[model samples]
Target chain A: GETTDGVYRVMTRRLLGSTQVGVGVMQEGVFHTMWHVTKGAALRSGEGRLDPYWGDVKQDLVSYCGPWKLDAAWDGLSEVQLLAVPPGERAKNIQTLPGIFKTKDGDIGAVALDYPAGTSGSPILDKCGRVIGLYGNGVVIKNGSYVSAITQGKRE
Target chain B: DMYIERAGDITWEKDAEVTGNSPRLDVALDESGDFSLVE
Candidate 1:
């Protein structure tokens, strides 16, 4: 509903449930995201046999994404838009209501997105409508909410 | 749920340009117009 076209729901591999209820993304035709997400997928259920890339981890990048989780294997290539976005107040950051456009914490290795819970592994598109980063670590706060960007896999 | 690491304290001052390596996954719709990761 938020944005489900290229996005998808994360479900358990055995078709058990949306257990992780988190998210995993499709390979970007290519790097780190695949290996990490793949590795993370298996880790979630303590089984790495079916991981997408078969590996360990990085920035904790792993989630259930895409539609194949509903029935069979991933029937389609990843069509999700990936980019960092404003969850709530950050919209002001984008609207020029401004503060620091840059920060000591940079969006290089990662970006920060303030989305709600149960929305981990959600995909974000740049305002330009192009893919950028895979979102993870769904956040809710006594203080506030903001998640990390699962660096997208890039092609060489 | 994706794991998130907590932080200490942070702040935002002047506007910093949003720039860096924005990588894109190479893909294309196959003859079927379905998504396919480029090999």
Candidate 2:
């Protein structure tokens, strides 16, 4: 609910009776949950993959040897928002998280959040309500705004 | 839980307090392309 300095909200995803907290991101018209989250789903299924219901949600886990840049993934994006779910509801509830302005390189800057501990893999949205990044670690935005247990992730 | 070895041989445990009460396993990806609890 805090909108000062263009900052906004981020949300988490979970299934009924599951304590695991997962984040999601949408890229190229498909919703992709965090690779780590998919690991948990696989364990629950005991199949070494994901259950039938969650198989489509997990993204392909790929390894990179160096730092992955987010410029291409965030190109030409504005008005980013996050999805929030209400109590007992499984539908989409959209909200906004700040720091999504485009950079001089025609890409976008990182949008960090003061994400709680449980919401590790929550989705970060573009203005069009599309997910462009994952919310992972916590960071201090430096200046006057600082919150504990923050969220930080890269677009890939 | 994820553990990293230090300069010598010290194992540093990475922990997350999901419920804000204690260290708990949330979700993690394994090298085997599977999911595992933090603990």
Candidate 3:
């Protein structure tokens, strides 16, 4: 009924969030240099978590990518804003890892995880034959994880 | 459909080490790479 158990073997990004936390995929030609969390994924409810050590999917992204289906998941976020890249552009954008810095600017509280330092050596595969996120660094950090859009802070 | 979650314009900067100095700030990309999504 599902595809590949929703498992995915991905190259990791090197940053603090994923590096210190976990890793996963970022774009078309780029792979996050960090670690990935693959836990707390709810297929039935189409809900997932992203925040570190939180639920399966990050609460910040509940409305953006939640309750996703097979084809819908691939569409990716409507717009992704990384460190330097602007909105409406997800691919080919440079991501600045957030580390110990929460500022008032749009880019605040950002952290990245570099995968080279990963030790788990694990791969991601889903039940639906479509896998997302990563797991390695010689150990497993989180379970049932998914990738959430990284954007700037809300303009107020 | 896209909704305007944030309002107003914000001066964006790259990711870099925070310097508790003057107006000068360090900006840079934390990581460089890409990943793919499947349908």
Candidate 4:
């Protein structure tokens, strides 16, 4: 009899179905995408509040195809450098923010959702390269950045 | 476990306007699709 419901023990990236954000990323392979916002309940209850009758209303676009469960170094990390600003620069290139690790494969807490513009959509890594989280927000992207490697579940 | 292409069924009702720059989901470069991750 042991109980500690703050929930901790994480090892994500198993992608098969049941998504609240923890898409898929396994560089040189494994890419995921999903977008569906048919009003998303006023943008998931407006946390940051910006609904002055927001434009481009109801929408739905969901696509899923799976088979995941990665480990064995997940094959990534080789030539890395991220901190974007290229596609019309304003004379600047000095960005750094990567190093936020702790999760054991049973994830809960740290909720901040709002992703349907391609849904976290892409780019999330953490082995000190830095694209740092996206797709569903549980964060998984190895050689580009966000590597807290453990990822194990959702084998749907 | 993959191969399904139902790409566009658009709607955006709120004062929806005409555009000159629309790039939310645009796939080009001789558009032929494929995304991997299967068993």
Docking class of 2: incorrect
DockQ of 1: 0.03
Candidate-wise lDDT, in order: 0.31, 0.31, 0.23, 0.22
Candidate 2 stretches with Cα past 4 Å from truth are A1-18, A25-31, A35-48, A51-72, A75-77, A85-108, A142-156, B1-39
lDDT of 2 by residue, A1-156 (tens): 111111111222344453334444322322334444344232221122212222322222211122222222334323333342222333233333344322222222334334444444454444443445555432343344322221223444
Worst 10 residues of 4 chain A by lDDT: A1-10
What level of docking quality does candidate 4 show?
A: incorrect
Flag regions of model 1 displaced more than 4 Å. Answer: A1-5, A13-20, A27-39, A42-50, A54-56, A62-116, A137-143, B1-39
* TM-score of every prediction relative to native: 0.37, 0.37, 0.18, 0.22
**lDDT score for residue A43 of model 2:** 21
List the lowest-lDDT window of 10 residues for candidate 2 chain A. A1-10
Candidate 1: how large is its RMSD? 15.6
For residues A47-95, what per-residue lDDT tens digits would candidate 4 score against the true structure? Answer: 2221212111111112222232222221232221121112122111122
lDDT of 3 by residue, A49-96 (tens): 222222212212111122322221211211112222112222122223
Winner by lDDT between candidate 4 and candidate 2:
2
lDDT of 3 by residue, B1-39 (tens): 111111111122244233211111123322221222211
CA lDDT, candidate 3, residue B30: 28
lDDT of 4 by residue, B1-39 (tens): 111111111111232222221111111111111111111
- Candidate 3 residue runs with Cα over 4 Å from true position: A1-7, A11-105, A112-114, A117-156, B1-26, B29-39
Candidate 1: give the TM-score of chain A.
Answer: 0.42
